[PDB]
């Protein structure tokens, strides 16, 4: 389990293969039905392709529908310019308050994680020294035990 990242400054592709070899050894209504069918088939349901084309010389209705539509647009368009003009930039200000809040959280997350990493790093250098101390003492016995036996 233990593998020191900060301390071990001196193989990933090799060890990945050895770990790989041990792995070789071991709620909606009707809405969901038509939505999943539309995505699976890759086909969007056709809309009213009628209003744009039409033809001069049933059309008494189509004419009267056009008139009303235009009126609505124009009244609506007029409100929208003035309404749009009033709001054309009032909503843009809201989007800047929404954006800056996300990047403040990017910083708050950035600061915690950095601290954690630093902690880990510091922690390592502690033990890597202790392991260095152990190995020096290991090599001392190794030759000490020999030099005792050589003389006996």
């Amino acid at each position: 389990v233990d593998a020191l990242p900060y301390f071990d400054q001196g193989v990933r592709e090799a060890a990945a293969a050895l770990v790989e070899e041990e792995t070789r050894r071991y709620t909606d209504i009707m809405r969901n039905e038509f939505e999943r069918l539309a995505a699976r088939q890759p086909i969007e349901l056709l809309s009213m392709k009628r209003y744009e084309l039409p033809a001069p010389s049933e059309c008494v209705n189509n004419s009267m529908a056009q008139l009303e539509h235009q009126a609505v647009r124009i009244e609506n368009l007029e409100l929208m310019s003035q309404h749009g003009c009033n709001a054309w930039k009032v909503y843009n200000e809201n989007l800047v308050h929404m954006i800056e809040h996300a990047q403040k959280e990017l910083q708050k997350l950035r600061k915690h994680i950095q601290d954690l990493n630093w902690q880990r790093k510091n922690m390592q250098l502690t033990a890597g020294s202790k392991l260095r101390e152990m190995e020096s003492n290991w090599v001392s016995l190794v030759s000490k035990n020999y030099e005792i036996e050589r003389t006996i």
């Binding site: 593998a3 990933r12 050895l18 190794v142």
Partner: protein, 33 residues
Amino acid sequence: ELSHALYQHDAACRVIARLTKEVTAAREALATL
């Protein structure tokens, strides 16, 4: 779970790299002695 595993996997992978080179050092040492 994917992130914690992949990190800890390549972390545990470095245990082997270290372990293999020490094991190797024990062989030539004992062999030559």
